[PDB]
Amino acid sequence: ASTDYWQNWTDGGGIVNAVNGSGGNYSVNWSNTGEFVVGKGWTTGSPFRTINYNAGVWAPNGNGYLTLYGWTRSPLIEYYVVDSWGTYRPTGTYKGTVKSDGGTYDIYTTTRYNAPSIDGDRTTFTQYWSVRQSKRPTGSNATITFTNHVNAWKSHGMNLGSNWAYQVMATEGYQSSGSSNVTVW
């Protein structure tokens, strides 16, 4: 599928050189950053979407995530399906696990306080995560069958909102440097 949304958000810290590439392709080259999230995908997310990507470069130097990323409203929820990471593997309150696309992912909830969101600069909101139990190899085509994650989240009382906001395949970083290159479809 063609992507129609370009995500390029930095909290202003350090350098985030994000290149909006041909089609579904993008790169990020980052240096000593605050928090940032860059990626490609769709203006309207869906729990029924299938997301494919190929990460031709995955070279974080420190804390970075290669991750499906998006939001809902009613309620406001920032969510992740993390397939690979740098030095830090993101964890939180353990809920259970889900098998999807040849991987097994731990399921977590965390909360952010006084943090940027789609609806304000100082917001408190829940985060939902599926984090793969081992890093997914990169450089071959990969698929995130997101309905498998949504259903698993539901089966643990993690209910997404009714009003879907954007949904991308992202590189997110904090307090780190590195390079990524990702094609999404």
Ligand SMILES: *[C@H]1OC[C@@H](O[C@@H]2OC[C@@H](O)[C@H](O)[C@H]2O)[C@H](O)[C@H]1F
């Ligand atoms: C999850 O990722 C980073 C940040 O989300 C951003 O909030 C500001 C909004 O304009 C952007 O669209 C988001 O990427 C959020 O604080 C963090 F929890």
